[PDB]
Design a protein around this ligand. Sequence first.
Ligand SMILES: NC(=O)C1=CN([C@@H]2O[C@H](COP(=O)(O)OP(=O)(O)OC[C@H]3O[C@@H](n4cnc5c(N)ncnc54)[C@H](OP(=O)(O)O)[C@@H]3O)[C@@H](O)[C@H]2O)C=CC1
Length: 318
Amino acid sequence: HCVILNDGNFIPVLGFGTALPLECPKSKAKELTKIAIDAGFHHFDSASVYNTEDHVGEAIRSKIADGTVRREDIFYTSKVWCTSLHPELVRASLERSLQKLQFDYVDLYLIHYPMALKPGEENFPVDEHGKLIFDRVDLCATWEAMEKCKDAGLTKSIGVSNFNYRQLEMILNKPGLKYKPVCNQVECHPYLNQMKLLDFCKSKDIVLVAYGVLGTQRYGGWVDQNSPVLLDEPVLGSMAKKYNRTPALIALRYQLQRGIVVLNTSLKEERIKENMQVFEFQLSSEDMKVLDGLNRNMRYIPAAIFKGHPNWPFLDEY
Ligand SMILES: NC(=O)C1=CN([C@@H]2O[C@H](COP(=O)(O)OP(=O)(O)OC[C@H]3O[C@@H](n4cnc5c(N)ncnc54)[C@H](OP(=O)(O)O)[C@@H]3O)[C@@H](O)[C@H]2O)C=CC1
Protein backbone atom coordinates (compact mmCIF):
# COMPACT_ATOMS: atom_id res chain seq x y z
CA HIS A 1 0.00 0.00 0.00
CA CYS A 2 2.22 2.78 -1.33
CA VAL A 3 2.01 5.80 -3.59
CA ILE A 4 4.73 7.19 -5.85
CA LEU A 5 6.39 10.51 -5.01
CA ASN A 6 7.31 13.07 -7.66
CA ASP A 7 10.95 11.97 -7.46
CA GLY A 8 10.11 8.35 -8.25
CA ASN A 9 10.41 6.91 -4.75
CA PHE A 10 7.65 4.99 -2.98
CA ILE A 11 6.09 5.84 0.36
CA PRO A 12 3.74 3.62 2.41
CA VAL A 13 0.34 5.36 2.66
CA LEU A 14 -0.04 4.55 6.36
CA GLY A 15 2.74 5.58 8.70
CA PHE A 16 3.32 5.27 12.43
CA GLY A 17 4.21 8.51 14.17
CA THR A 18 6.85 8.40 16.89
CA ALA A 19 6.10 11.64 18.74
CA LEU A 20 5.04 11.16 22.37
CA PRO A 21 2.89 12.91 24.99
CA LEU A 22 4.86 14.95 27.54
CA GLU A 23 4.37 12.38 30.32
CA CYS A 24 6.00 9.51 28.42
CA PRO A 25 9.65 8.51 28.86
CA LYS A 26 11.67 8.62 25.63
CA SER A 27 12.18 4.85 25.78
CA LYS A 28 8.46 4.46 25.06
CA ALA A 29 9.26 5.22 21.42
CA LYS A 30 11.40 2.09 21.15
CA GLU A 31 8.65 -0.10 22.59
CA LEU A 32 5.97 1.32 20.29
CA THR A 33 8.11 1.17 17.16
CA LYS A 34 8.76 -2.54 17.77
CA ILE A 35 5.03 -3.15 18.26
CA ALA A 36 4.21 -1.15 15.12
CA ILE A 37 6.70 -3.17 13.07
CA ASP A 38 5.14 -6.42 14.30
CA ALA A 39 1.72 -5.04 13.34
CA GLY A 40 2.83 -4.46 9.76
CA PHE A 41 3.88 -0.80 9.74
CA HIS A 42 6.83 0.04 7.49
CA HIS A 43 6.61 3.85 7.47
CA PHE A 44 7.85 5.65 10.61
CA ASP A 45 7.71 9.38 11.16
CA SER A 46 10.21 11.12 13.42
CA ALA A 47 11.96 14.49 13.78
CA SER A 48 15.21 15.78 15.22
CA VAL A 49 13.33 17.91 17.76
CA TYR A 50 11.61 14.81 19.19
CA ASN A 51 15.03 13.73 20.52
CA THR A 52 14.01 10.07 20.33
CA GLU A 53 15.50 9.13 16.97
CA ASP A 54 18.01 7.03 18.89
CA HIS A 55 15.18 4.97 20.42
CA VAL A 56 13.29 4.57 17.15
CA GLY A 57 16.52 3.69 15.35
CA GLU A 58 17.34 1.06 17.96
CA ALA A 59 13.88 -0.48 17.54
CA ILE A 60 14.26 -0.65 13.76
CA ARG A 61 17.82 -1.97 13.91
CA SER A 62 16.71 -4.58 16.45
CA LYS A 63 14.00 -5.85 14.10
CA ILE A 64 16.46 -5.91 11.21
CA ALA A 65 19.08 -7.75 13.26
CA ASP A 66 16.65 -10.41 14.46
CA GLY A 67 15.33 -11.15 10.97
CA THR A 68 11.93 -9.45 11.13
CA VAL A 69 12.47 -6.76 8.47
CA ARG A 70 15.05 -5.34 6.05
CA ARG A 71 16.25 -1.71 5.92
CA GLU A 72 15.04 -1.30 2.34
CA ASP A 73 11.51 -2.22 3.44
CA ILE A 74 11.39 0.51 6.09
CA PHE A 75 10.55 4.11 5.21
CA TYR A 76 11.97 6.46 7.85
CA THR A 77 11.29 10.20 7.95
CA SER A 78 13.18 12.83 9.91
CA LYS A 79 12.84 16.62 10.01
CA VAL A 80 15.34 19.43 10.42
CA TRP A 81 14.35 21.71 13.31
CA CYS A 82 13.99 25.51 13.35
CA THR A 83 17.40 26.07 14.97
CA SER A 84 19.22 24.44 12.04
CA LEU A 85 17.51 25.98 9.00
CA HIS A 86 20.55 28.13 8.17
CA PRO A 87 22.03 26.60 4.98
CA GLU A 88 25.32 25.79 6.71
CA LEU A 89 23.57 23.90 9.50
CA VAL A 90 21.10 21.67 7.62
CA ARG A 91 23.45 18.84 6.65
CA ALA A 92 25.14 18.89 10.05
CA SER A 93 21.76 18.22 11.65
CA LEU A 94 20.94 15.37 9.28
CA GLU A 95 24.36 13.81 9.90
CA ARG A 96 23.70 14.05 13.63
CA SER A 97 20.37 12.26 13.20
CA LEU A 98 22.03 9.54 11.12
CA GLN A 99 24.56 9.03 13.93
CA LYS A 100 21.76 8.77 16.51
CA LEU A 101 19.96 6.25 14.27
CA GLN A 102 23.11 4.47 13.12
CA PHE A 103 21.54 4.63 9.65
CA ASP A 104 23.33 5.37 6.36
CA TYR A 105 20.38 7.41 5.06
CA VAL A 106 16.82 8.46 5.90
CA ASP A 107 14.05 7.91 3.37
CA LEU A 108 12.56 11.37 3.75
CA TYR A 109 13.83 14.62 5.25
CA LEU A 110 11.55 17.60 5.84
CA ILE A 111 11.81 21.21 6.93
CA HIS A 112 9.78 20.94 10.18
CA TYR A 113 8.43 24.52 10.11
CA PRO A 114 9.09 27.45 7.75
CA MET A 115 10.30 29.36 10.83
CA ALA A 116 13.90 29.75 11.95
CA LEU A 117 14.94 30.17 15.58
CA LYS A 118 18.23 31.32 17.12
CA PRO A 119 20.92 28.69 16.38
CA GLY A 120 22.20 26.68 19.33
CA GLU A 121 21.85 23.43 21.25
CA GLU A 122 18.58 24.59 22.84
CA ASN A 123 15.61 23.71 20.62
CA PHE A 124 13.41 26.41 22.11
CA PRO A 125 15.63 29.47 22.74
CA VAL A 126 13.78 32.19 24.64
CA ASP A 127 14.52 35.69 25.87
CA GLU A 128 14.09 36.91 29.45
CA HIS A 129 10.34 37.33 28.89
CA GLY A 130 9.95 33.68 27.91
CA LYS A 131 9.41 34.47 24.23
CA LEU A 132 11.04 32.43 21.48
CA ILE A 133 13.98 34.12 19.79
CA PHE A 134 13.13 34.20 16.10
CA ASP A 135 15.75 34.23 13.37
CA ARG A 136 15.61 35.13 9.69
CA VAL A 137 16.81 32.61 7.12
CA ASP A 138 16.74 32.37 3.33
CA LEU A 139 14.39 29.37 3.02
CA CYS A 140 15.33 28.98 -0.64
CA ALA A 141 18.92 28.60 0.56
CA THR A 142 17.65 26.12 3.16
CA TRP A 143 16.02 24.19 0.34
CA GLU A 144 19.23 24.17 -1.70
CA ALA A 145 20.92 22.63 1.32
CA MET A 146 18.16 19.99 1.42
CA GLU A 147 18.76 19.25 -2.28
CA LYS A 148 22.47 18.77 -1.61
CA CYS A 149 21.58 16.28 1.12
CA LYS A 150 19.57 14.29 -1.41
CA ASP A 151 22.38 14.46 -3.98
CA ALA A 152 24.84 13.33 -1.28
CA GLY A 153 22.68 10.26 -0.67
CA LEU A 154 21.94 11.14 2.96
CA THR A 155 18.20 11.19 2.25
CA LYS A 156 16.27 9.61 -0.62
CA SER A 157 13.60 12.31 -0.77
CA ILE A 158 13.04 15.82 0.54
CA GLY A 159 9.88 17.69 1.47
CA VAL A 160 8.39 20.17 3.90
CA SER A 161 5.99 20.34 6.82
CA ASN A 162 3.58 23.04 7.97
CA PHE A 163 4.06 25.18 4.86
CA ASN A 164 1.19 27.26 3.49
CA TYR A 165 0.48 27.78 -0.21
CA ARG A 166 2.55 30.96 -0.54
CA GLN A 167 5.52 29.29 1.14
CA LEU A 168 5.24 26.31 -1.22
CA GLU A 169 5.12 28.74 -4.16
CA MET A 170 8.33 30.37 -2.91
CA ILE A 171 10.10 27.04 -3.38
CA LEU A 172 8.30 26.01 -6.57
CA ASN A 173 9.10 29.34 -8.27
CA LYS A 174 12.68 29.41 -6.98
CA PRO A 175 15.31 30.13 -9.65
CA GLY A 176 17.48 27.06 -10.08
CA LEU A 177 15.06 24.70 -8.33
CA LYS A 178 16.28 21.13 -8.82
CA TYR A 179 13.90 19.06 -6.69
CA LYS A 180 10.31 19.96 -5.85
CA PRO A 181 9.21 19.03 -2.33
CA VAL A 182 7.71 15.53 -2.49
CA CYS A 183 5.23 16.33 0.27
CA ASN A 184 3.83 18.87 2.68
CA GLN A 185 3.14 17.26 6.06
CA VAL A 186 0.31 19.18 7.72
CA GLU A 187 -2.51 18.80 10.21
CA CYS A 188 -5.61 17.30 8.58
CA HIS A 189 -8.84 15.74 9.88
CA PRO A 190 -12.62 16.28 9.48
CA TYR A 191 -12.57 19.50 11.55
CA LEU A 192 -9.72 20.94 9.40
CA ASN A 193 -10.05 19.13 6.09
CA GLN A 194 -7.53 21.29 4.19
CA MET A 195 -9.64 21.17 1.02
CA LYS A 196 -7.86 24.15 -0.53
CA LEU A 197 -4.30 23.20 0.39
CA LEU A 198 -4.92 19.58 -0.64
CA ASP A 199 -6.15 20.70 -4.07
CA PHE A 200 -3.12 22.95 -4.48
CA CYS A 201 -0.68 20.21 -3.49
CA LYS A 202 -2.31 17.75 -5.88
CA SER A 203 -1.99 20.22 -8.78
CA LYS A 204 1.76 20.43 -8.10
CA ASP A 205 2.31 16.68 -7.60
CA ILE A 206 3.01 17.25 -3.91
CA VAL A 207 1.61 14.60 -1.57
CA LEU A 208 -0.18 15.86 1.52
CA VAL A 209 0.93 13.80 4.52
CA ALA A 210 -1.46 14.25 7.41
CA TYR A 211 -0.95 14.33 11.15
CA GLY A 212 -3.72 14.95 13.67
CA VAL A 213 -5.82 12.48 11.68
CA LEU A 214 -7.34 11.27 14.94
CA GLY A 215 -7.31 14.69 16.60
CA THR A 216 -3.66 14.67 17.77
CA GLN A 217 -2.25 13.38 21.03
CA ARG A 218 -3.30 16.75 22.49
CA TYR A 219 0.24 17.59 23.58
CA GLY A 220 0.54 19.77 26.65
CA GLY A 221 1.90 23.19 25.76
CA TRP A 222 0.74 22.89 22.16
CA VAL A 223 -2.92 21.88 22.13
CA ASP A 224 -5.74 23.73 23.90
CA GLN A 225 -7.03 21.14 26.38
CA ASN A 226 -10.54 22.58 26.06
CA SER A 227 -10.70 21.88 22.32
CA PRO A 228 -13.26 19.25 21.29
CA VAL A 229 -11.90 15.69 21.13
CA LEU A 230 -12.18 14.62 17.49
CA LEU A 231 -13.07 10.97 18.02
CA ASP A 232 -16.01 12.02 20.21
CA GLU A 233 -17.68 13.47 17.11
CA PRO A 234 -21.19 11.95 16.84
CA VAL A 235 -21.00 11.75 13.05
CA LEU A 236 -17.91 9.52 13.32
CA GLY A 237 -19.69 7.37 15.89
CA SER A 238 -22.79 6.95 13.74
CA MET A 239 -20.71 6.16 10.67
CA ALA A 240 -18.59 3.71 12.65
CA LYS A 241 -21.76 1.84 13.60
CA LYS A 242 -23.02 1.88 10.01
CA TYR A 243 -19.81 0.36 8.63
CA ASN A 244 -19.24 -1.86 11.66
CA ARG A 245 -15.84 -0.31 12.37
CA THR A 246 -14.63 2.28 14.92
CA PRO A 247 -14.51 6.10 14.89
CA ALA A 248 -10.72 5.99 14.44
CA LEU A 249 -10.97 3.66 11.44
CA ILE A 250 -13.55 5.95 9.82
CA ALA A 251 -11.30 8.99 10.30
CA LEU A 252 -8.28 7.14 8.87
CA ARG A 253 -10.18 5.80 5.86
CA TYR A 254 -11.62 9.24 5.06
CA GLN A 255 -8.12 10.59 4.49
CA LEU A 256 -6.84 7.60 2.52
CA GLN A 257 -9.73 7.95 0.07
CA ARG A 258 -8.75 11.58 -0.53
CA GLY A 259 -5.28 10.55 -1.70
CA ILE A 260 -3.63 11.61 1.55
CA VAL A 261 -0.73 9.70 3.19
CA VAL A 262 -1.79 9.23 6.80
CA LEU A 263 0.23 9.15 10.00
CA ASN A 264 -1.17 7.75 13.23
CA THR A 265 -0.01 7.14 16.78
CA SER A 266 -1.33 5.11 19.71
CA LEU A 267 0.33 4.12 22.95
CA LYS A 268 -1.83 0.97 22.99
CA GLU A 269 -0.85 -2.19 21.12
CA GLU A 270 -4.49 -3.12 20.49
CA ARG A 271 -5.08 0.16 18.67
CA ILE A 272 -1.85 0.01 16.71
CA LYS A 273 -3.02 -3.36 15.39
CA GLU A 274 -6.58 -2.13 14.82
CA ASN A 275 -5.51 0.82 12.69
CA MET A 276 -4.05 -1.55 10.08
CA GLN A 277 -7.63 -2.66 9.41
CA VAL A 278 -8.20 0.60 7.55
CA PHE A 279 -7.32 -1.24 4.32
CA GLU A 280 -10.29 -3.59 4.72
CA PHE A 281 -13.27 -1.38 3.92
CA GLN A 282 -14.46 1.50 1.73
CA LEU A 283 -16.51 4.57 2.63
CA SER A 284 -19.23 5.40 0.10
CA SER A 285 -19.02 8.57 -1.98
CA GLU A 286 -22.07 9.92 -0.18
CA ASP A 287 -20.56 9.32 3.26
CA MET A 288 -17.30 10.97 2.20
CA LYS A 289 -19.43 14.07 1.52
CA VAL A 290 -20.97 13.80 4.98
CA LEU A 291 -17.47 13.83 6.48
CA ASP A 292 -16.54 16.80 4.23
CA GLY A 293 -19.30 18.70 6.00
CA LEU A 294 -17.63 18.60 9.41
CA ASN A 295 -15.02 21.23 8.56
CA ARG A 296 -14.86 23.92 11.26
CA ASN A 297 -11.33 25.35 11.05
CA MET A 298 -10.31 23.62 14.28
CA ARG A 299 -6.51 23.68 14.28
CA TYR A 300 -5.26 21.57 17.19
CA ILE A 301 -1.60 22.52 16.73
CA PRO A 302 -1.39 26.19 15.74
CA ALA A 303 2.24 26.43 16.93
CA ALA A 304 1.02 29.29 19.12
CA ILE A 305 4.41 29.89 20.74
CA PHE A 306 5.58 30.91 17.25
CA LYS A 307 2.90 33.57 16.84
CA GLY A 308 4.56 36.82 15.85
CA HIS A 309 7.15 35.04 13.73
CA PRO A 310 7.26 36.71 10.28
CA ASN A 311 6.74 33.30 8.68
CA TRP A 312 4.05 31.87 10.98
CA PRO A 313 2.23 29.69 8.39
CA PHE A 314 -1.31 29.76 9.72
CA LEU A 315 -2.37 33.37 9.17
CA ASP A 316 -3.12 32.97 5.46
CA GLU A 317 -6.41 31.33 4.44
CA TYR A 318 -4.29 28.39 3.28
N1 LIG B 1 4.99 17.71 11.47
C1 LIG B 1 4.38 18.15 12.59
O1 LIG B 1 4.32 19.35 12.88
C2 LIG B 1 3.75 17.15 13.50
C3 LIG B 1 3.80 15.77 13.21
N2 LIG B 1 3.21 14.85 14.06
C4 LIG B 1 3.35 13.43 13.65
O2 LIG B 1 2.08 12.83 13.62
C5 LIG B 1 2.10 11.61 14.41
C6 LIG B 1 0.73 11.31 14.91
O3 LIG B 1 0.47 12.01 16.12
P1 LIG B 1 -0.80 12.91 16.38
O4 LIG B 1 -1.24 13.60 15.11
O5 LIG B 1 -0.53 13.78 17.53
O6 LIG B 1 -1.95 11.93 16.79
P2 LIG B 1 -3.11 11.16 16.04
O7 LIG B 1 -4.12 12.18 15.62
O8 LIG B 1 -2.54 10.23 15.05
O9 LIG B 1 -3.73 10.30 17.26
C7 LIG B 1 -4.51 10.99 18.25
C8 LIG B 1 -4.96 9.98 19.28
O10 LIG B 1 -5.65 8.88 18.66
C9 LIG B 1 -5.76 7.85 19.63
N3 LIG B 1 -6.00 6.63 18.86
C10 LIG B 1 -5.16 6.05 17.92
N4 LIG B 1 -5.65 4.95 17.37
C11 LIG B 1 -6.86 4.79 17.98
C12 LIG B 1 -7.90 3.80 17.84
N5 LIG B 1 -7.77 2.78 16.98
N6 LIG B 1 -9.03 3.94 18.62
C13 LIG B 1 -9.16 5.00 19.50
N7 LIG B 1 -8.23 5.99 19.71
C14 LIG B 1 -7.10 5.83 18.91
C15 LIG B 1 -4.47 7.91 20.40
O11 LIG B 1 -4.73 7.68 21.78
P3 LIG B 1 -4.10 6.45 22.59
O12 LIG B 1 -2.60 6.59 22.50
O13 LIG B 1 -4.71 6.65 23.97
O14 LIG B 1 -4.61 5.22 21.91
C16 LIG B 1 -3.87 9.30 20.14
O15 LIG B 1 -3.66 10.10 21.28
C17 LIG B 1 3.20 11.90 15.45
O16 LIG B 1 3.66 10.78 16.19
C18 LIG B 1 4.23 12.58 14.58
O17 LIG B 1 5.00 11.58 13.94
C19 LIG B 1 2.51 15.27 15.25
C20 LIG B 1 2.44 16.63 15.57
C21 LIG B 1 3.05 17.59 14.70
